[PDB]
Scaffold this motif. Sequence first.
Motif, short mmCIF file in Angstrom:
data_model
loop_
_atom_site.label_atom_id
_atom_site.label_comp_id
_atom_site.label_asym_id
_atom_site.label_seq_id
_atom_site.Cartn_x
_atom_site.Cartn_y
_atom_site.Cartn_z
N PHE A 93 0.83 -1.19 0.00
CA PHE A 93 0.00 0.00 0.00
C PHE A 93 0.87 1.25 0.00
CE2 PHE A 93 0.55 -1.46 4.35
CZ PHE A 93 1.04 -0.33 4.98
N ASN A 94 0.33 2.31 -0.61
CA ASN A 94 0.95 3.64 -0.64
C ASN A 94 -0.13 4.64 -0.26
OD1 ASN A 94 2.39 5.97 -1.06
ND2 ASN A 94 3.13 5.41 -3.10
N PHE A 95 -0.27 4.88 1.04
CA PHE A 95 -1.28 5.81 1.57
C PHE A 95 -0.67 7.20 1.62
CE2 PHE A 95 -3.65 2.10 3.15
CZ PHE A 95 -4.93 2.50 2.84
N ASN A 96 -0.92 7.99 0.57
CA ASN A 96 -0.55 9.41 0.53
C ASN A 96 0.93 9.62 0.83
OD1 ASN A 96 -1.06 12.11 0.05
ND2 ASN A 96 -2.77 12.23 1.50
N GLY A 97 1.78 8.75 0.28
CA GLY A 97 3.22 8.82 0.45
C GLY A 97 3.76 7.84 1.47
N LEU A 98 2.91 7.32 2.36
CA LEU A 98 3.33 6.33 3.33
C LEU A 98 3.31 4.96 2.67
CD1 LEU A 98 3.71 5.06 6.27
CD2 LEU A 98 1.21 5.15 6.39
N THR A 99 4.49 4.38 2.45
CA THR A 99 4.63 3.12 1.74
C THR A 99 4.83 1.98 2.74
OG1 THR A 99 5.59 4.20 -0.20
CG2 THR A 99 5.95 1.83 0.04
N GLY A 100 4.06 0.92 2.58
CA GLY A 100 4.20 -0.22 3.47
C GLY A 100 3.66 -1.48 2.84
N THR A 101 3.85 -2.59 3.56
CA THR A 101 3.35 -3.89 3.14
C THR A 101 2.64 -4.56 4.30
OG1 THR A 101 5.15 -5.39 3.78
CG2 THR A 101 5.50 -4.04 1.82
N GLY A 102 1.57 -5.27 3.99
CA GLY A 102 0.85 -6.01 5.01
C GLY A 102 -0.62 -6.13 4.68
N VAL A 103 -1.36 -6.69 5.64
CA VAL A 103 -2.80 -6.86 5.51
C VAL A 103 -3.50 -5.73 6.26
CG1 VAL A 103 -2.53 -9.36 5.30
CG2 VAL A 103 -3.11 -8.37 7.49
N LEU A 104 -4.62 -5.29 5.71
CA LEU A 104 -5.41 -4.19 6.26
C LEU A 104 -6.74 -4.74 6.76
CD1 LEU A 104 -4.88 -1.70 3.27
CD2 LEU A 104 -3.34 -2.14 5.19
N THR A 105 -7.14 -4.30 7.95
CA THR A 105 -8.39 -4.74 8.56
C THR A 105 -9.14 -3.53 9.10
OG1 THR A 105 -7.59 -5.06 10.83
CG2 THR A 105 -7.23 -6.86 9.27
N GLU A 106 -10.44 -3.71 9.34
CA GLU A 106 -11.23 -2.67 9.97
C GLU A 106 -10.83 -2.52 11.43
N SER A 107 -10.57 -1.28 11.84
CA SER A 107 -10.09 -1.02 13.19
C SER A 107 -11.22 -0.52 14.08
CB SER A 107 -8.95 -0.01 13.18
OG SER A 107 -9.45 1.31 13.14
N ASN A 108 -10.91 -0.42 15.38
CA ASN A 108 -11.88 0.05 16.37
C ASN A 108 -11.38 1.28 17.14
N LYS A 109 -10.28 1.89 16.71
CA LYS A 109 -9.76 3.08 17.35
C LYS A 109 -10.09 4.31 16.51
CE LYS A 109 -5.53 1.55 17.42
NZ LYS A 109 -5.71 0.28 16.68
N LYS A 110 -10.50 5.38 17.18
CA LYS A 110 -10.93 6.61 16.50
C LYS A 110 -9.84 7.66 16.66
N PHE A 111 -9.31 8.14 15.54
CA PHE A 111 -8.32 9.20 15.56
C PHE A 111 -8.99 10.54 15.85
CE2 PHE A 111 -4.93 7.13 12.61
CZ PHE A 111 -4.75 6.14 13.55
N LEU A 112 -8.18 11.52 16.25
CA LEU A 112 -8.64 12.89 16.24
C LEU A 112 -8.75 13.38 14.80
CD1 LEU A 112 -6.48 14.26 19.20
CD2 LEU A 112 -8.91 13.68 19.24
N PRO A 113 -9.60 14.38 14.53
CA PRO A 113 -9.84 14.77 13.13
C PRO A 113 -8.60 15.23 12.38
CG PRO A 113 -10.78 16.36 14.68
CD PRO A 113 -10.43 15.15 15.47
N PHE A 114 -7.56 15.70 13.07
CA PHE A 114 -6.35 16.16 12.42
C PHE A 114 -5.26 15.10 12.34
CE2 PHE A 114 -5.61 16.84 16.86
CZ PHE A 114 -4.27 16.61 17.04
N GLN A 115 -5.52 13.89 12.82
CA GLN A 115 -4.53 12.83 12.84
C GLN A 115 -4.74 11.86 11.68
OE1 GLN A 115 -5.47 11.52 16.77
NE2 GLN A 115 -3.67 12.48 17.70
N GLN A 116 -3.64 11.50 11.02
CA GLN A 116 -3.68 10.62 9.86
C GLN A 116 -2.84 9.36 10.02
#
Lengths: 228, 145, 87, 23
Positions: free
Chosen positions: C8-31
């Motif tokens: 995956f390449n999320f807006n410049g953040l490059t990584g490898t792995g599996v993605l799942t639905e999470s249960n933690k809520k970020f603050l609106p300004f946190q990415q």
Amino acid sequence: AYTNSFTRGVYYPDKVFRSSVLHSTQDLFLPFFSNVTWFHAIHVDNPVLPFNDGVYFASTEKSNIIRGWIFGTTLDSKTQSLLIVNNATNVVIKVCEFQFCNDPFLDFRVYSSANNCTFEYVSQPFLKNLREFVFKNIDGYFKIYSKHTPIDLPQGFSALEPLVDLPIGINITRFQTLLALHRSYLTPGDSSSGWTAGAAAYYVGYLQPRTFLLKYNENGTITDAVDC
Amino acid sequence: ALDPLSETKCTLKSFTVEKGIYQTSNFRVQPTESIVRFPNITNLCPFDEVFNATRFASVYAWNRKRISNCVADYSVLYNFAPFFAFKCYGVSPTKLNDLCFTNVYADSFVIRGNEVSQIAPGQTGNIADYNYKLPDDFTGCVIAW
Amino acid sequence: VKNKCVNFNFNGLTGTGVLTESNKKFLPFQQFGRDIADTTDAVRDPQTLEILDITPCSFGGVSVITPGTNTSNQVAVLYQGVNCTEV
Amino acid sequence: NKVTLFNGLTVLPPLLTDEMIAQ
């Protein structure tokens, strides 16, 4: 005048979520238990304050006397100044060196020389309620953090959330505050007597490179800090 | 690399292996796919009041303007102008979809057909000498319809 | 793409792995979400603003169980840090 | 109850479980 600053002036430095952890960060912060300069927004003629490395600006008022800020190296047309004007409708940020006098005009609606306006921005305005702001400019971007908290300065802890990160790359070394008054005469120069206005006060502090230990709770919010 | 027993013989470097458990190698599943994710951002630069207006500046008043702080895909145009002379200099069409700059300055005029040649780099005449002068060095696209 | 070992390449953040639905809520300004030892564990989708938990896809060692070639050539294989019911 | 608590690194489990040691 002088007055000490309590454990105030912290902000989220990296917008990276952390849950229930202690993190050590080295950045520009306002040291704990340090004195901050105090001004009354009635009368004294508006002093110019240097922008050394970053400014912590706190305001307590109930009449919206102050409505913006001016940044830049000089008030003339030689350097591209920055102007932020808040209002009841929206906030307008411009970078084209509005020609100021020996003192900036108190907001004959437009009094400036030729303009080269390259950067302009509009968004929702920054609306007893203590308003805290941090202004920084380090890597070619101009960052504004802020928080509005209910009610001299209390001992409560509150971290400033990032609002604005502008991409303008001008050099800022001096700044002032912008006041407003209806039916106010405009003159290039006035004495320190001024005119009667609503009661208001604002505090100014300077940021220094310091190491801090911040605590994040399970909800990802900073709840306490330690000055190292 | 035939079977696990041959790999064990490789690891022990012996044709006879003794009873037991032997750690031979490591495994890793696959990257079965590659995905790129970019924002729901949709602010676009206002290219429509520049290229469509009901009137344009005459040459003596040449109406400069500033496009700032916006995603600009220079693909919104190439839609209605059979540009006599798109003539871009140095940027070329595809690359600028890619690049990022502080501001884009769009100037608009109305000059008669024979003079459209003069609004270019390095031309001399009434239009480019008394009315609008493009600089000697330029990265920009004159467009005329 | 979800539930697969993906690059995956999320807006410049490059990584490898599996993605799942999470249960933690970020603050609106946190990415970004970072755990201890500076390892990225979560990220918000820039298109849908939905939080995704990132965990690396399976890896581990392989071990060979043998009774000895002098007795028999039968071999068993153990995958250590994984459950190859979902290999 | 009193005492309680990658990148290629892993933790091999012990051979005897706690139940066997208790036995």
